[PDB]
Amino acid sequence: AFDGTWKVDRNENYEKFMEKMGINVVKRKLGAHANLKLTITQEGNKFTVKESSNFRNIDVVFELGVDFAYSLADGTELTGTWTMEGNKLVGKFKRVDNGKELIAVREISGNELIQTYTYEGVEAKRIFKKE
């Protein structure tokens, strides 16, 4: 493992969007409604290896600083960057829905992870990770 694998959660869009975005009938709550495993390992300027989620499971593509634009569980809505060293995270782009560029944190604490996503402005996170 380049850094770890630690795996459950993510931030709640299910909260952000729940609280602010659109909320509705938990439509854009991609925040919480799935198990997932997160791993990150290949080159050293990277953080990327993780195939597990409620239905799909594969997540392996990163750069010293990039993320994707697609919708984590809908049409297409996401940003691309993630720029840090492997120890912390900070990288961001604007979403796909039109453009919300905000995302910056590593998920790490003793062993507990923190994925803080953002979008125009909402940071939010939910994770308790790693065995």
Tell me the β-bridge partners of 65: 83
Q: Three-state SS string across the chain, please?
A: CCCCEECCCCCCHHHHHHHHHCCCCCCCCCCCCCCECEECCCCCCCCCECCCECCCCCCCCCECEECCCCCCCCCCCCCCCCECCCCCCCCCCECCCCCCECECCCCCCCCCCCCCECCCCCCECCCCCCC
Sketch out the chain's domains with CATH numbers.
Answer: 1-131 (2.40.128.20)
Question: Is 6 flagged in the annotation as binding?
Answer: no
Method: NMR
Which residues are CB-contacts of 44 (< 8 A; sequence separation ≥ 6)?
2, 86
106 is in an annotated binding site: yes
Contacts for 115-120: CB closer than 8 Å, 24+ residues apart: 115/9, 115/10, 115/11, 116/11, 117/10, 117/11, 117/13, 117/16, 118/92, 119/16, 119/21, 119/79, 119/94, 119/95
Which pair of structure tokens corresponds to residue 127? 């994770």
